[PDB]
Design a protein around this ligand. Structure first.
Ligand SMILES: *[C@@H]1O[C@H](CO)[C@@H](O)[C@H](O)[C@H]1NC(C)=O
Lengths: 253, 10, 36
């Protein structure tokens, strides 16, 4: 995150860390949607143009963390993957359309003060909150700047959803209905953005109706970090919810 | 820079 | 696990469960053209 702040303790108990076994390194963020399922961006696992093709065995999930590099003994829980599921139409060849994947844990995790799942939006939540000007929140242990570094604690930043045309005119990539963009305008005199390391994390909003936190987007792609006239792009979780339901009920939950 | 994790996890 | 998330989904043990607010959630609620 660029121009965020340190999160408070237990502020995003659904924030997961995707961790490389060896070398030991932070791959991406992710989020806990129940006691066995994690939601992330497909391009954290599979990205052929960079020879990236992670397997179940190559990874670890770390839940309940605060600090980026310490092993938070008696706080954090580290799990193993049972299986990875990528959207069958994830489009890595052209724009990362449908950048989403589920990870089924080897065993259910136990909730605690620092570990708790976020909700998945229903059609009506999506309809009231996904609006231009409304703010969401992104969290992650990624870069502090486009190039220099690494925070020592989970960072946060609140950002406004931006109107589709402003999104489309800021880039040359073809934007689809499975993506939305967020960020302040050069005008606005306020900064912020996800950056390298943040991918796969959650863009969340808190419903004013029922007081619950919902995950509306997944940190997906951007051009640089925090550049003027550029926005971050997020996978639209509600549009992809039926592939989500399908996998959860055809294979576990 | 990553602190070592228990081996029970590798 | 699904539709609208979980059950207990989205209620934080240290904030929503105790009726405590985090330091910038206000900023969100005020943008939904002031909250609840
Ligand atoms: C990723 O690796 C798996 C084997 O673990 C392979 O089946 C799949 O073809 C690879 N994805 C490619 C190379 O696009």
């Amino acid at each position: 995150i660029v121009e965020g702040s340190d999160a408070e303790i237990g502020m995003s108990p659904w924030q997961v860390m995707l961790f490389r076994k060896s070398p030991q390194e932070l791959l991406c963020g992710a989020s806990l949607i129940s006691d066995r399922w994690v939601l992330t961006a497909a391009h954290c696992l599979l990205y052929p143009p960079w020879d990236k093709n992670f397997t179940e065995n190559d990874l670890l999930v770390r839940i309940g963390k605060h600090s980026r590099t310490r092993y938070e003994r008696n706080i954090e829980k580290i799990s193993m993957l049972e299986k990875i599921y990528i959207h069958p139409r994830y489009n890595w060849r052209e724009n990362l359309d449908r950048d989403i994947a589920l990870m089924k844990l080897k065993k259910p995790v136990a909730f605690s003060d620092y570990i708790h799942p976020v909700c998945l939006p229903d059609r009506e939540t999506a309809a009231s909150l996904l609006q231009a000007g409304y703010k969401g929140r992104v969290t992650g242990w990624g870069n502090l700047k486009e190039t220099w570094g690494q925070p020592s604690v989970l960072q946060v930043v609140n950002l406004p959803i931006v109107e589709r045309p402003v999104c489309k005119d800021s880039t040359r990539i073809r934007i689809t209905d499975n993506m939305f963009c967020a960020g302040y305008k050069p005008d606005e005199g306020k900064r912020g953005d996800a950056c390298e390391g943040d991918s796969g994390g959650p863009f969340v909003m808190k419903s004013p109706f029922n007081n619950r936190w919902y995950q509306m987007g997944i940190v997906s792609w951007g051009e640089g970090c925090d550049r003027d006239g550029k926005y971050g792009f997020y996978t639209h979780v509600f549009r992809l919810k039926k592939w989500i339901q399908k996998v959860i009920d055809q294979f576990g939950e | 820079d990553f602190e070592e994790i228990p081996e029970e996890y590798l | 696990t699904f539709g609208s998330g979980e059950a207990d989904c989205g209620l934080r043990p240290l904030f929503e469960k105790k009726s405590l607010e985090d330091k910038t959630e206000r900023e969100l609620l005020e943008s939904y053209i002031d909250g609840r």
